[PDB]
């Protein structure tokens, strides 16, 4: 579904991880809308970010993010056992279409 | 004009003539056409093209202009205050075109 992504990045309690979202020219590069979505395993996703680097109500500081030109990346700062989930990147997709990322799981040992 | 608002006309005693007013300060205005139009070219006879509006990509919206109401009310009040002088101590109003 386009938007190649680090399909599985492992970790442990305590450290920070950067999870990326690779766009070609238009989807991420043209304008500045990106968002990340957390599926609890086998369940419906929910919400943590809008406008790349801001948060809604009900989200902590750890679920940060930033733009890097032709690639946007979530920054799960201080990964813990709660992060057993998959963080889906979605963004503007050129024309008037919204594209969705390929997914990336985060596993905590 | 560097000094306060100026009012100009040939003969204010005549109602036909058009008044021209210079404001002491500008008021910011913005206009937009949010529809993301597209252009296509159709060729006619020799290498003699003609462009026309294609299909509206995305959603449709109405072109609009934005004027800051704070500055606009202040400026309209000042112009009324100035116009009250040449016409002796009457009320002044503004109506549609």
């Amino acid at each position, epitope marked *: *579904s386009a938007l190649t992504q680090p399909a599985s990045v492992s970790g442990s309690p305590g450290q920070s991880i950067t999870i990326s979202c690779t766009g070609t020219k238009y989807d991420v590069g043209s304008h500045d*809308l*990106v*968002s990340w*979505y957390q599926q609890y395993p086998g*369940k*419906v*996703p*929910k*919400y943590m970010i*809008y406008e790349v680097n801001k948060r*809604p109500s009900g989200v902590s500081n750890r679920f940060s993010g930033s733009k890097s030109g032709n690639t946007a990346s979530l920054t799960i700062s201080g990964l813990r056992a709660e992060d057993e989930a*998959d963080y*889906y990147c*979605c*963004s*503007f*997709g050129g024309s*008037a*279409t*919204v*594209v*969705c*990322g*390929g*997914g990336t799981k985060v596993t905590v040992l | 004009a560097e000094k306060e608002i100026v009012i100009r006309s040939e003969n204010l005693t005549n109602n036909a003539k058009i008044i021209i007013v210079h404001l002491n300060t500008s008021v910011e205005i913005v206009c937009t056409r*949010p*529809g*993301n139009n597209t252009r296509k070219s159709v060729r006619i006879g020799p290498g003699q093209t003609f462009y026309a509006t294609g299909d509206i990509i*995305g*959603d*449709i*919206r*109405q072109a*609009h202009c934005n004027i800051s109401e704070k500055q606009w009310n202040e400026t309209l009040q000042k112009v009324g205050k100035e116009l009250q002088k040449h016409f002796p101590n009457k009320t002044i109003k503004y109506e549609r075109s």
Partner: nanobody
Amino acid sequence: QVQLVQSGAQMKNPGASVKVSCAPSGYTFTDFYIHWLRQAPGQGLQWMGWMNPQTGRTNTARNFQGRVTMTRDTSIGTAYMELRSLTSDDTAIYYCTTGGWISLYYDSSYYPNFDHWGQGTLLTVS
């Protein structure tokens, strides 16, 4: 504040058209876009098409154009989906979501927020 509560399980055979729907509640229906999302088992979300509820204009991703038809329902709020030329490869859970904010001054259809979700409908085709 917002709850979409869609339909439960649905059953169809290949080649038909499926009526998937979502029942918004807790907010004025004609003030938010409706974005439809696929989730086939094992892969990530794939976007289907945004719906304007005030005016019936719609759009669809290029991988689904023609096959997907949708209509609004302002009386009840339950927007409808129609997936013609159905295939067993479409054995995927279909989602319903509230998009951005509709207004008279700037196009906000592609704003990919997706604030509130539905609970996933297990549609299997064979």
